[PDB]
Amino acid sequence: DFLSNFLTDFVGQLQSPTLAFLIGGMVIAALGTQLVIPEAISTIIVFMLLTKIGLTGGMAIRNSNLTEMLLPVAFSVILGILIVFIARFTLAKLPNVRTVDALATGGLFGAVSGSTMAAALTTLEESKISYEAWAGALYPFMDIPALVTAIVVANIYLNKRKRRVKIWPIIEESLQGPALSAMLLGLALGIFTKPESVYEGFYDPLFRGLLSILMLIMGMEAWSRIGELRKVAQWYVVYSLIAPIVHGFIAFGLGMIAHYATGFSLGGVVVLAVIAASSSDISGPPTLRAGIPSANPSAYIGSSTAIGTPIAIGVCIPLFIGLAQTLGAG
C-alpha cells in the first residue's frame, strides 16, 4: 500500500549511505568529537557536486525541446513564492512568533539545499527510477524567487509598522553565490561544449563518495544549531517538522499536473518535491541577513539547519520516492 511501502523504505534508506553519514555525523557531534572537516574541503565538495549536476543538466538541454521544461520551470517559480506566503499566514499567526522572523524562516524553506537535492538524485539512481537530467537546473528557479519574496514582503511589513526595495541586486547576489555559480558554469559547459570525457572520468565517479562526506558535514551542522533553537519558541520546532512534508506534497501535486500535460516523468516530480521540501542552510542565511537585518538569526538558521534538513533527507526522500512506486505500477 502506501504506509506499507514507506516504512520498509525508511529502514531501507537507513541501511544505506547518504542517510547513515547524516546520522553518523549527528551522533559524533553529540558525543563531542574534535573531528572537523576543513572549510577548504567543504568548498571544493560543493563545487564538485554542483558542477556534475550542471554538466548533466545541459548535456540533456541541447537535446531537449525547451517546451518540456516550461511547466516545471513555471511551477518551481510559483512554489518559491507560495512557501513564503504559507509561513506568513500560518507561522506568523502564532503567539510568540515575530512576523519578521516567520518571513525569514519561510524564505529559507522556500530556498533549496543543494546538499538535499544531490541526496535525492543518488537515491533515485539506486532505486532505478529514471528522471529528466535537466531537473537539477530547477534549483535556481525556486531558490531565487523565494529569497526575493521574503525580502520584499518583510520590507513592506516594516514600512507598514513604521507608518521600495531594489529587486535586481538581490537576484545579482544570488546568481553570484559560490553554489549557484558552479551549477551555471556546468550548465553552460554542457550546452555549448562537449565535456563528456572529463565528466565520465572525474565528476561522475567521484559523486557518491564526495556526497557521503557532505552528508557527514550536514549533520555535524545540525547538532551545532540545536542550541540556537532553544532561544526562540516551541512553534519553530513544530513548523520545522511538518512544513517540509507539506511543501513536498504541494509540489508533488503540482508535478502531477506537468506529468499529465507534457509527459514530465515521475522521477522528475520526485526531484520537484524534494527541492520544495529542502531548506537552504549555507547560501541562503547570508542573503537573508543582508536583506532582512531585523530578523533574529537564531530563528531561521536554527529551524532550517537543525531540523529541516534532517527531515528532508531522512523522512521526505523515502516518502516521495516510495510514493512514486505506487503511481507508476501500470
Binding site: 567543504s42 568548498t43 551545532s224 547560501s283 542565511p285 547570508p286 538569526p297
Partner: protein, 109 residues
C-alpha cells in the same frame, strides 16, 4: 614619528564588503583586515560556510588615521548603520607612524 590614531573594528565576517566601502569614503589611506574568532553577546553567525568548520567567523579592521576626528567619523557611520543588527565592538588606541608612503607622504616622517 608622526602621531596617529588606531581605530579597530571587530564585527561579523559578512560585513567585509560593506565596511571597506565606508573606510574608502571617509578619506582614510588604508586599512588592515584579519579573520578572527571570539565570543560576545550576539554569537550566532552565518558566513556562507558550515558553522562547525567556521572557527574564525569575525573580521578585525585596523585603520590608522592622522586625526582623531576622522576615526570617530568612520566609527559613527559603521555603528549607526550595522550595530543595531550585527555583532560588533569599536575601540581606538593611540600610535605613532614611523614609516609609510601614503601616510607620511613623500616628505617623510
Amino acid at each position: 614619528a608622526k602621531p596617529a590614531n588606531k581605530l579597530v573594528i571587530v564585527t561579523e565576517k559578512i560585513l567585509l564588503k560593506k565596511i571597506a566601502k565606508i573606510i574608502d569614503e571617509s578619506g582614510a589611506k588604508g586599512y588592515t583586515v584579519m579573520n578572527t574568532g571570539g565570543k560576545g553577546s550576539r554569537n550566532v553567525r552565518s558566513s556562507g560556510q558550515p558553522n562547525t568548520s567556521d572557527i574564525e567567523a569575525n573580521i578585525k579592521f585596523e585603520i590608522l588615521t592622522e586625526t582623531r576626528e576622522m576615526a570617530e567619523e568612520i566609527a559613527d557611520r559603521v555603528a549607526v548603520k550595522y550595530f543595531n543588527d550585527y555583532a560588533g565592538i569599536i575601540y581606538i588606541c593611540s600610535a605613532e607612524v614611523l614609516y609609510g608612503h601614503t601616510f607620511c607622504g613623500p616628505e617623510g616622517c
